[PDB]
Structures are given as C-alpha cells and as structure tokens.
Scaffold this motif. Structure first.
Motif, PDB file in Angstrom:
ATOM      1  N   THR A  73      -6.569  -4.522  -6.105  1.00  0.00           N
ATOM      2  CA  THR A  73      -7.621  -3.558  -6.410  1.00  0.00           C
ATOM      3  C   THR A  73      -8.051  -2.817  -5.150  1.00  0.00           C
ATOM      4  O   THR A  73      -8.162  -1.584  -5.141  1.00  0.00           O
ATOM      5  N   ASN A  74      -8.274  -3.559  -4.063  1.00  0.00           N
ATOM      6  CA  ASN A  74      -8.634  -2.936  -2.795  1.00  0.00           C
ATOM      7  C   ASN A  74      -7.494  -2.076  -2.262  1.00  0.00           C
ATOM      8  O   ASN A  74      -7.725  -1.009  -1.685  1.00  0.00           O
ATOM      9  N   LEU A  75      -6.252  -2.535  -2.434  1.00  0.00           N
ATOM     10  CA  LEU A  75      -5.107  -1.748  -1.983  1.00  0.00           C
ATOM     11  C   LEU A  75      -5.039  -0.411  -2.713  1.00  0.00           C
ATOM     12  O   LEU A  75      -4.825   0.640  -2.095  1.00  0.00           O
ATOM     13  N   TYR A 111     -18.235   3.709  10.199  1.00  0.00           N
ATOM     14  CA  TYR A 111     -18.296   4.194   8.825  1.00  0.00           C
ATOM     15  C   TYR A 111     -17.288   3.465   7.946  1.00  0.00           C
ATOM     16  O   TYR A 111     -16.126   3.863   7.867  1.00  0.00           O
ATOM     17  N   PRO A 112     -17.733   2.393   7.297  1.00  0.00           N
ATOM     18  CA  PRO A 112     -16.843   1.620   6.425  1.00  0.00           C
ATOM     19  C   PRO A 112     -16.289   2.480   5.305  1.00  0.00           C
ATOM     20  O   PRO A 112     -16.987   3.366   4.788  1.00  0.00           O
ATOM     21  N   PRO A 113     -15.032   2.260   4.913  1.00  0.00           N
ATOM     22  CA  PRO A 113     -14.467   3.028   3.790  1.00  0.00           C
ATOM     23  C   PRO A 113     -15.269   2.899   2.508  1.00  0.00           C
ATOM     24  O   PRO A 113     -15.376   3.869   1.749  1.00  0.00           O
ATOM     25  N   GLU A 114     -15.832   1.718   2.242  1.00  0.00           N
ATOM     26  CA  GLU A 114     -16.662   1.547   1.055  1.00  0.00           C
ATOM     27  C   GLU A 114     -17.927   2.392   1.145  1.00  0.00           C
ATOM     28  O   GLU A 114     -18.405   2.918   0.133  1.00  0.00           O
ATOM     29  N   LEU A 115     -18.485   2.531   2.350  1.00  0.00           N
ATOM     30  CA  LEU A 115     -19.664   3.371   2.532  1.00  0.00           C
ATOM     31  C   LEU A 115     -19.362   4.821   2.173  1.00  0.00           C
ATOM     32  O   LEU A 115     -20.160   5.491   1.508  1.00  0.00           O
ATOM     33  N   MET A 116     -18.207   5.320   2.606  1.00  0.00           N
ATOM     34  CA  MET A 116     -17.765   6.670   2.262  1.00  0.00           C
ATOM     35  C   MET A 116     -16.827   6.601   1.058  1.00  0.00           C
ATOM     36  O   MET A 116     -15.650   6.958   1.114  1.00  0.00           O
ATOM     37  N   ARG A 117     -17.384   6.122  -0.052  1.00  0.00           N
ATOM     38  CA  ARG A 117     -16.620   5.920  -1.273  1.00  0.00           C
ATOM     39  C   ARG A 117     -17.535   6.103  -2.473  1.00  0.00           C
ATOM     40  O   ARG A 117     -18.661   5.599  -2.487  1.00  0.00           O
ATOM     41  N   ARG A 118     -17.044   6.832  -3.476  1.00  0.00           N
ATOM     42  CA  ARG A 118     -17.773   7.006  -4.724  1.00  0.00           C
ATOM     43  C   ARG A 118     -16.898   6.830  -5.955  1.00  0.00           C
ATOM     44  O   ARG A 118     -17.409   6.944  -7.073  1.00  0.00           O
ATOM     45  N   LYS A 176       0.823  -1.205   0.000  1.00  0.00           N
ATOM     46  CA  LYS A 176       0.000   0.000   0.000  1.00  0.00           C
ATOM     47  C   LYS A 176       0.860   1.258   0.000  1.00  0.00           C
ATOM     48  O   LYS A 176       0.542   2.234  -0.690  1.00  0.00           O
ATOM     49  N   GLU A 177       1.949   1.258   0.773  1.00  0.00           N
ATOM     50  CA  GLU A 177       2.851   2.408   0.765  1.00  0.00           C
ATOM     51  C   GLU A 177       3.487   2.603  -0.606  1.00  0.00           C
ATOM     52  O   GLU A 177       3.633   3.737  -1.074  1.00  0.00           O
ATOM     53  N   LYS A 178       3.875   1.507  -1.263  1.00  0.00           N
ATOM     54  CA  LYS A 178       4.436   1.605  -2.607  1.00  0.00           C
ATOM     55  C   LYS A 178       3.411   2.167  -3.586  1.00  0.00           C
ATOM     56  O   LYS A 178       3.737   3.003  -4.440  1.00  0.00           O
ATOM     57  N   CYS A 179       2.159   1.718  -3.473  1.00  0.00           N
ATOM     58  CA  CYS A 179       1.102   2.235  -4.336  1.00  0.00           C
ATOM     59  C   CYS A 179       0.886   3.726  -4.106  1.00  0.00           C
ATOM     60  O   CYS A 179       0.723   4.494  -5.059  1.00  0.00           O
ATOM     61  N   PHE A 208      -8.067  -1.348 -13.635  1.00  0.00           N
ATOM     62  CA  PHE A 208      -6.736  -1.497 -14.200  1.00  0.00           C
ATOM     63  C   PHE A 208      -6.820  -1.692 -15.707  1.00  0.00           C
ATOM     64  O   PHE A 208      -7.841  -2.123 -16.248  1.00  0.00           O
ATOM     65  N   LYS A 209      -5.724  -1.363 -16.383  1.00  0.00           N
ATOM     66  CA  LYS A 209      -5.605  -1.534 -17.822  1.00  0.00           C
ATOM     67  C   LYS A 209      -4.564  -2.604 -18.115  1.00  0.00           C
ATOM     68  O   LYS A 209      -3.498  -2.633 -17.493  1.00  0.00           O
ATOM     69  N   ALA A 210      -4.884  -3.483 -19.055  1.00  0.00           N
ATOM     70  CA  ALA A 210      -3.991  -4.583 -19.383  1.00  0.00           C
ATOM     71  C   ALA A 210      -2.682  -4.045 -19.954  1.00  0.00           C
ATOM     72  O   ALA A 210      -2.707  -3.163 -20.824  1.00  0.00           O
ATOM     73  N   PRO A 211      -1.532  -4.533 -19.495  1.00  0.00           N
ATOM     74  CA  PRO A 211      -0.259  -4.082 -20.068  1.00  0.00           C
ATOM     75  C   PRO A 211      -0.145  -4.480 -21.532  1.00  0.00           C
ATOM     76  O   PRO A 211      -0.778  -5.434 -21.988  1.00  0.00           O
ATOM     77  N   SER A 212       0.670  -3.724 -22.271  1.00  0.00           N
ATOM     78  CA  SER A 212       0.834  -3.976 -23.700  1.00  0.00           C
ATOM     79  C   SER A 212       1.376  -5.375 -23.965  1.00  0.00           C
ATOM     80  O   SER A 212       1.149  -5.945 -25.038  1.00  0.00           O
TER      81      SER A 212
END
Ligand SMILES: [Zn+2]
Ligand SMILES: [Zn+2]
Lengths: 275, 256, 208, 262
Positions: free
Chosen positions: A64-66, A103-110, A6-9, A115-119
């Motif tokens: 994806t969640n990260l 307050y779940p993070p997904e609840l406060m999320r819009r 997560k820190e790297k992301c 992701f896009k497939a690499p070439s």
C-alpha cells in the motif's frame, strides 16, 4: 528488493491498457485536486503479473505504501492547469515558505490509495476469519449494527516553537501518542535550553474517522451457536458510506490491536452495500 | 544447636515409647503405627499429647506454647524414624516420603469467645460447627526460581506452611527483580479453607453467633463437610491501623 | 535375527531338489516388501476400511508360527541381497540395539569363530549350547556304542524354531558323516512339533 | 540430553511402522494429505511395543511429549521436506486406556501434577477465540535488513516469560517496521469443565477445572456437552509485586478433546 517492486508498480501505473490511461487520467485529476480516492484493481495486475498479486495479497501493508509513493512520484508530471483551490494548509505552507526564503511525503499528500479484491477471492464469514489471516487481505460480509459519528483523527503533528522558527513534525502511526513537550530544534539545542513548543492545529493534518460493528447473518450462523461481531475501522472517502441495519460486504485488512493476546480489527478498503 | 537436641529427643520418644505391663506384654505404639501406615500408603500418624508429656514433660510443654518449630522438628523426626523402620524398600521407592503428624488430647475444650490476644501462637482446642468450605486448591512447599536475563537457577527453596508467602530476592547475584518461578519445578500439596461457627448453646442471649476461619492441609482436606459438629485443635495465628486477620492452622480434627 | 529366524538348506536336503529358505515369524509389511523386490515366496500354512477387513483375515496369524514363508530356487539369491540391505534386521532401540544377526554353521566360513559345547557328567550327561541336528545325530551315534544301545534323552527345544519341520517337497563333500547325510535326506514327518523325549532300548528307537 | 536422545530414537523407531503392519506410517501420510499438523497416537500400541515409554509418558509427560513431537517432525521431514518446512512444530495427541489416570474434577488432586490425565465432565463456559503471537518478523528500511524474534509465555510447554515484544529500534537506533503478514499467529481459547451433576455428592458444590485449548483444538465443544479432555496437568505460579502468596492455581493443558454423546 522493494525498490524493484516500486519500479514495477510505476511501470504498471504509467502504462495501462483499456490503451486508455485510467491511472494516468486519475493521477492528473488528483494533481488537479479533482479526485482523492484512487482504487487500484488487482485483476489488472493479474493480467500483467500474478506474482505481484500474490505478493501484495500476502502482505497488504508495505505494498500500500509502495503504491502510494509510486503515485506520489507520478503526480508532478500531470499538473497541467495549476490549482484553483484555497486550502488553509496550503496557505500556511505558502506563508511559511515565504518566511523561509526571507517535509514528510505523507504531510504533502492528499490522495488515499485502496485495493480491490480480485475476482478469485471469495467472501468469508466472520467466524471464518481465523488467526492465519493476520496481515492478509480478506472479504467479510454481514450486517452493520452500530456506526459512530465522523470525527477528526490526527495523522501528522506540526509543532512550532517560540525560540526558533523551524516547525517540528511528529507523525502519529498509533491510536494513542504523547505530545512533544520540549522543542528539539537545533536552534534550541545551541541555546542549551529547549523551547516550550506548542502544536499548531492550523498546520496539522486531520482525516475523517469512523468506527462500525459488523455482525453475522442469522441464517448462516449455526442453530446452537450465537452470532459473533467484528470491529471495522473506516477512514477517508469510505466514511458516511454505511448505516446501521444494512447488509454489506467489506474488503479490508485483518490486523491486531496493540495497546501475547490481543484483540483484532478490520482496516476497511472497499465497502459495498449488498442488498 | 538446641534444634538437633530437640530432634534427637523426639526421635527417642518415637523409638522408645511402649504400652502395657510385664504381666501381659509390651508393644511399641508409634513405631509400629508408623511402619504400618507407611506400608499401607498413608503418610501420617496421630500422636497423643498425654503420651508425650509422660515420656518428657518439657517436650510436651514446648509444644503447647511454641507449636511451629517443635511440630516441624517432630515431623522431621517422624520422617527419619519411618525411613529407618522400612529401610530396605522395594525397587523404585528408595526416596523417603514426608510424614504429617496430627495431635490429640483429652483436655477440656475452650470457647471461641474466650480466645484472648495473649493466646497467640499457642495450641488451642475449640469446638464448633462447620458452616462453609471451599474448593481444594494447591499450596506450594518447594519452589525453584530462575533469572530472566542470565538464567541463573536457585532451586529447593522452602516455603513456610500456612497462609504465608515468600519474598522474592531483588539482587540477581539483569534488572531489579529478575526472578520468575519455574512452573514445572514446584511441589504442591492440597489446600482448603473452612468457617467454624460457635456452638448453638455457647452463644449468649440476644446475639448472633460468631465465626472463625480455619486452614486445612494435606490429609486434613475433605474430612469435614458443612453441617458437622467438630472439635478443632490448631495454632492461633495472624495472616484500621495495625489490624491483622487471624486464622487457625488446624493440626487435628475430631468429627462428632 | 532379533525378530525372525531363517534356515538355508542345500539342494537335496529334506526331500527338496533346489535351495530353499524358511522364515518363521513373518509380518505383512515384510512380505509386501519382499513382493516389491522380485522374490516369489509361498506361505504353506470406506473402501479402505473394507480392504483392512480383507487384510484382517491375512493379518491374523502374524507374529505367530503360522506365518512361515518358503522361498525356493534362484529367489534365494535375491532374498540374501534383500536381507543384507534390509533396514529392520538390526534393532534401532532396545537392549539388542546395533547388534548384527548371529550366523550358525557346521563348517568354516569367512569370519567364523570355532566354538565348543559344554559337556558335564553328573549316571547322567549334560550338554548345553546351540545344538544343531548333525551334532545330535553324532551324539546319538556315539552313545549307542558307548552305552551298548541303552540310554534315554531329554531334549529342550527353542520354540520359535519348531515350525522349521514343515514339509517341503551329490552331498558327499558337504563335510558330514554319511549316516547323517542319509538321515537328513528324508521327508519331514513332524509339523510345528519337535522331539521332547528320545528313548533307545536294545538298539531300537522309540521317540516320544 | 542423553535421556531425551534415547527417547527420540525410540519414538522415531515406533513411528516408522513400515516393515511391520503399516499403521502409523499410513497415519502420517493421511495427516500430510489432509493438511493437518496433529497426530492422534493411541498409547495402547506404545504400551504393547514399548511398555517403559508408555509408563514414563504417563508419569512424566513434558519431556516425553517434546521428544515425541521432535521424532514426528523428523519422520514428516523424511516423508516430505516441503510440508515439514511449512509448519514449525508438529503436535501429538493421545488416546486409549490410561489406568489410574482416568479421573474426574473431584478426584484430580495435587499429586497428579505433571502427569498425563484424562478428565471427564460437562462444559460450563467457553471464551472467545483471540489470536496469540509466536514469531514476529521486523524490517529496517534504512539498512534493508529483516529481523526475526521468537516469543513464549507461561501457559505453554517449555514455559518462559518473554519480554521486549515487538522491538522498534535496531542496535544503532535505526527505525524498525513490523511486517504483520510475515509473522506467525495462533488461536487461543479457555474453557471450564464441571463434574457430572448426577455423580456429585449432595449438599456440596460441584468441582471444576480450567483447561487451555490452542490451534485446531479451538471451537470443538460448546457449553452443555459431555466431553473427555486429555492433557498435562500443571500449576500457574502467581507473583504480586515482590511477593508470592504460595497458593497457585492449577490449569490443564489440552492435546485431545473428544465428545461423548456426539
Ligand atoms: Zn524551538
Ligand atoms: Zn541474571
């Protein structure tokens, strides 16, 4: 360690060369409610670190969640010009907060992250999607033969009980669920009689849902063999992006259906109308 | 118990029956036949019913009215006699195979429309014509079960012949009903079902012919094809309120 | 061993001039393993599919007495080391599992166990056991004097050791009778064949 | 088991055909190079080198197959450790001459159960290739622990009915999340073979036998083909409530599918 991932992301997200901060600008737009769909491209990750690209390609469920959580953390530091919206969910939250002070993070999320497939990745036929690609990232192509109407799908439920004031939460991560019957709030537990709580549709979260079937190109199909189909689930901004009779190439996640032998479906991430 | 006495009497019948007169000579009929069939590889014999009556009328009378247990005892006696006649078997064939006994008699045949409800669990002899048959499936005789949780094993369970099952135990001796059948530890035999139609002349005027379901096992399978006239000897048995389907466990076929 | 048999000869025996070694039932894999160790032997008797076809001519007489292999010179030392370190001398499955190969010799060596042949007279005389050439020659020498040069002999041979007669071309302390040394220092006349009947009449030998 | 240990030793000796003509040593190398996990073993060679194992395999296929697979795994690990680490278990397929086991769907009686047979016929129907679960890897976000579990069913060798599939709670009721990308899945297909129409007795319907294909054996033949399947013959017990009818159906596990017409 997922924390290091997560820190790297986050480190990748804040600093992106182009040094035009595409991710930064888009996150600012999302914080301003100017953008919903954020499509992370994997070639940039390959430019920085291909090991993360391989790791994310092997399992496109956790990362994806990260990425979503990293974007959520980066969002607050870009809300410059407050908000200009009139969301019913925000009105409900504001009045509930006013009563709370009185307050779940997904609840406060819009924002929805894709992701896009690499070439490097190559398109595959429906017959070529075997059982060794379950949970991975694949790119199938074919002809859409059937599309359903857009319907709302419950994501997280928001119940309210008459006895207490603390609203109940119930995330829905399965195609089917059972509604809560008795209120588990500590106020009701103290009363030794759980209240008959009811779901408040106004405070609930709904997302656009669409289902489509993709077939195989006749020319690619062997003469003896008959064409095969595949079910694709489309949620979010990707809805209303395809019509029956259109040649498409879909990048998504190959997953089984649970409800030792199981059916399979494709979780769409990026739809392109090829020819 | 009386079961042991009955088994001993059946063994004596098999070992001591002789045919012929002292003017020509005597030949044991069923012991020689058992030895010959066992050496040839065919594990069956065809026991007549007048011979058993002549040897012991009570034994024959207990087979015309309670065929199940008495036929089982007769088969066990046949197995023991066949084991003792060919006692020094070649290497690798120490274990003794099970013998199937088929019955035959010269009585006047009955009719399908004459089968009352009193004649249930009795030997019957009904002619007819075969109009249908099924694929040769498998029927278990010895099964072994194992618990799902504590993997306790209860082997060598016996299953009754015919269209009759085995109620599995509930207590594990591990939730309720923790026992499953081990696949490879099962001994099976051949299994077929036929349909017998009433003879074309015994059918009354202005009425369609009646039918009756049959059951065939082991060496009786694949002996009759549809369109054959047969005479069947079998055990009448059962497989609305209180209504039960009735079939016929076939123990002998005489293709005409 | 349980698959093949070897015979080491000293320098001078059978017409040779250096130490030799003979392996009768050799296989292609064993020969290739020998090649990859420095041993220089000499048998005296799809593109990969085409290579297999070429090997078919090579692999025809394998597991047969025609695959005899002759090692000579200092290569016998490397052959000894290879045999000691080989992994197919001792069977790993079967009746002879784990049993090391048998060693036979006419003289004592470290770990040897003195043995004797069984003799029994019935006129006829019977001798059983592993018969080596020096024993046969000594027996003939004794019987010539004892029987006044008149006897007949019937020899039963171990077939997988008959090809050892294949021609290949100071032994006073070897511990053999000088007549036996003189006889064994000859040129191998028989080929893939062994004596089956020996007859001596009036001090003259007429072998069959 | 001592018998299984002896079988494993003998099979490992048979496979390591290195100092002999290098047939099955070359075959294993070829299989590793081509990225496969199934070796086609001709049992004429086994009969030529060890007749007792050939006959015992023809009469008791289960234990001998398990021992042969484990010996093959050991040999592959000897050749290349990483490749052996990639695949949990290797498979073995047979061919050659079987003797009295060369049967047809009509002559496949119930006395051949548990015996390696070779059935000839013509395909009539094929199902769709759906995946099956073998091993699932779970993860607990709270404790940062990675859990693992193995599954099995009644339609595989070493059959065992396994329940509690996809656990969701830990020992202390901690939430558990399933990592789909780390789990192992395999294909599954079901076919049916029929006795040749030209060799079927008149009047009577032709016979049939249901076979089970898995992994690389899927999508190897289509309806209307003359095939020759080789595999173990076994029964599938059926339980209804607390009762068993006793009339079990028969299935034929498959380890080598060969076409005839081609
Ligand atoms: Zn409440
Ligand atoms: Zn138990």
């Amino acid at each position: 360690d997922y924390q290091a991932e997560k820190e790297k992301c986050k480190t990748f997200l804040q600093e992106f060369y182009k040094k035009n901060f595409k991710y930064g600008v888009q996150l600012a737009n999302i914080a301003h409610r100017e953008q919903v769909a954020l499509c992370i491209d994997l070639d940039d990750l390959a430019e920085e670190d291909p090991e993360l690209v391989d790791a994310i390609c092997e399992n496109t469920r956790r990362y994806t969640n990260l990425f979503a959580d990293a974007v959520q953390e980066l969002l607050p530091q870009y809300k410059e010009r407050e908000v200009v919206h009139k969301d019913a969910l925000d009105v409900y939250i504001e009045h509930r907060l006013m009563m709370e002070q009185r307050y779940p993070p997904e609840l406060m999320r819009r924002f929805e992250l894709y992701f896009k497939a690499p070439s490097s990745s190559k398109a595959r036929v429906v017959r070529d999607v075997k059982a060794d690609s379950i949970g991975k990232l694949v790119t199938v192509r074919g002809i859409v033969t059937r599309v359903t109407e857009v319907k709302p799908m419950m994501v997280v439920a928001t119940y309210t009980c008459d006895q207490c004031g603390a609203e109940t939460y119930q995330p829905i991560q399965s195609p089917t669920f059972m509604p809560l019957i008795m209120c588990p709030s500590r106020e009701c537990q103290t009363n030794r009689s759980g209240g008959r709580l009811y779901l408040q549709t106004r405070g609930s979260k709904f997302i656009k849902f669409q289902e489509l079937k993709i077939q195989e190109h006749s020319d690619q199909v062997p003469v003896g063999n008959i064409p095969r189909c595949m079910s694709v689930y489309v949620r979010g901004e990707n809805t209303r992006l395809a019509q029956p009779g259109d040649h498409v190439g879909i990048t998504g996640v190959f997953l089984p259906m649970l409800r030792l032998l199981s059916e399979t479906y494709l979780e769409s991430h990026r739809l392109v109308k090829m020819n | 118990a009386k079961k042991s006495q009955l088994k001993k009497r059946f063994r004596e019948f098999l070992r001591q029956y002789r045919i012929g007169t002292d003017r020509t000579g005597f030949t044991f009929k069923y012991r020689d036949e058992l030895k010959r069939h066992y050496n040839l590889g065919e594990y069956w014999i065809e026991v007549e019913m007048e011979d058993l009556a002549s040897f012991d009328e009570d034994l024959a009378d207990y087979l015309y009215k309670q065929p199940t247990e008495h036929l089982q005892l007769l088969e066990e006696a046949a197995q023991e006699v066949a084991d003792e006649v060919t006692r020094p078997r070649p290497a690798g064939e120490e274990t003794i195979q099970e013998i199937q006994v088929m019955l035959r008699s010269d009585a006047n045949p009955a009719n399908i429309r004459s089968l009352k409800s009193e004649q249930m669990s009795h030997l019957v002899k009904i002619p007819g014509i075969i109009i249908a048959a099924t694929a040769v499936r498998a029927k278990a005789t010895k099964i072994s079960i194992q618990c799902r949780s504590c993997r306790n094993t209860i082997g060598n369970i016996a299953v009754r012949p015919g269209l009759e099952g085995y109620a599995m135990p509930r207590k594990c001796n591990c939730p309720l009903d923790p026992y499953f059948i081990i696949p490879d530890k099962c001994k099976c035999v051949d299994f077929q079902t036929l349909k017998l139609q009433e003879s074309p002349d015994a059918v009354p005027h202005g009425e369609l012919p009646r039918h009756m379901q049959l059951y065939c096992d082991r060496y009786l399978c694949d002996k009759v094809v549809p369109g054959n006239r047969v005479t069947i000897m079998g055990i009448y048995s059962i497989r609305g309120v209180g209504i039960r389907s009735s079939y016929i466990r076939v123990v002998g076929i005489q293709v005409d | 061993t349980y698959q093949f048999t070897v015979l080491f000869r000293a320098a001078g025996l059978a017409g040779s001039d250096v130490i030799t070694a003979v392996m009768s039932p050799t296989t292609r894999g064993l020969r290739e393993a020998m090649k990859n160790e420095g041993i220089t032997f000499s048998q005296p008797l799809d593109s990969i599919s085409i290579k297999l076809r070429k090997e078919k001519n090579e692999v025809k007489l394998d597991h047969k007495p025609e695959s005899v292999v002759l090692v000579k010179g200092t290569n016998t030392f490397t052959l000894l080391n290879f045999l000691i370190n080989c992994k197919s001398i001792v069977a790993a499955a079967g009746l002879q599992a784990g049993l090391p190969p048998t060693l036979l010799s006419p003289v004592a060596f470290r770990g040897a166990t003195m043995h004797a042949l069984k003799a029994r007279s019935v006129f006829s005389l019977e001798i059983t056991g592993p018969i080596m050439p020096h024993s046969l020659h000594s027996l003939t020498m004794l019987l010539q004097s004892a029987q006044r040069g008149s006897f007949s002999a019937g020899l039963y041979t171990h077939e997988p050791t008959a090809v050892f007669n294949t021609p290949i071309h100071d032994l006073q302390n070897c511990g053999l009778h000088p007549c036996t040394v003189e006889q064994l220092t000859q040129v191998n006349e028989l080929g893939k064949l062994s004596l089956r009947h020996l007859e001596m009449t009036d001090y003259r030998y007429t072998w069959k | 088991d001592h018998e299984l240990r002896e079988a494993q030793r003998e099979y490992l000796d048979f496979l390591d055909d290195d100092q002999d003509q290098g047939l099955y040593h070359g075959k294993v190398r070829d299989m590793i190079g081509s990225n496969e996990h199934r070796l086609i073993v001709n049992l004429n060679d086994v009969r030529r080198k060890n007749d007792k194992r050939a006959n015992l395999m023809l009469n008791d296929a289960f234990a001998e197959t398990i021992a042969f697979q484990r010996a093959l795994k050991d040999l592959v690990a000897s050749i290349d450790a990483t490749y052996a680490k990639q695949f949990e278990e290797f498979s073995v397929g047979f061919e050659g001459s079987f003797g009295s086991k060369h049967v047809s769907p009509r002559t496949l009686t119930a006395s051949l159960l548990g015996s390696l047979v070779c059935v000839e016929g013509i395909v009539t129907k094929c199902s769709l290739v759906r995946p099956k679960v073998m091993r699932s890897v779970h993860y607990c976000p709270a404790t940062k622990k990675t859990l693992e579990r193995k599954y099995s069913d009644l339609t595989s060798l070493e059959a065992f009915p396994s329940s509690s599939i996809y656990p969701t709670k830990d020992e202390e009721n901690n939430p558990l999340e399933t990592e789909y990308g780390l789990s192992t899945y395999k294909d599954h297909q079901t076919l049916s073979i029929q006795e040749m129409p030209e060799k079927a007795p008149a009047g009577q319907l032709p016979r049939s036998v249901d076979i089970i294909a898995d992994d690389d054996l899927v999508d190897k033949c289509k309806p209307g083909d003359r095939v020759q399947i080789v595999g173990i013959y076994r029964c599938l017990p059926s339980k209804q409530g607390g009762f068993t009818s006793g009339t079990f159906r028969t299935i034929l596990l498959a380890n080598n599918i060969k076409l005839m017409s081609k």
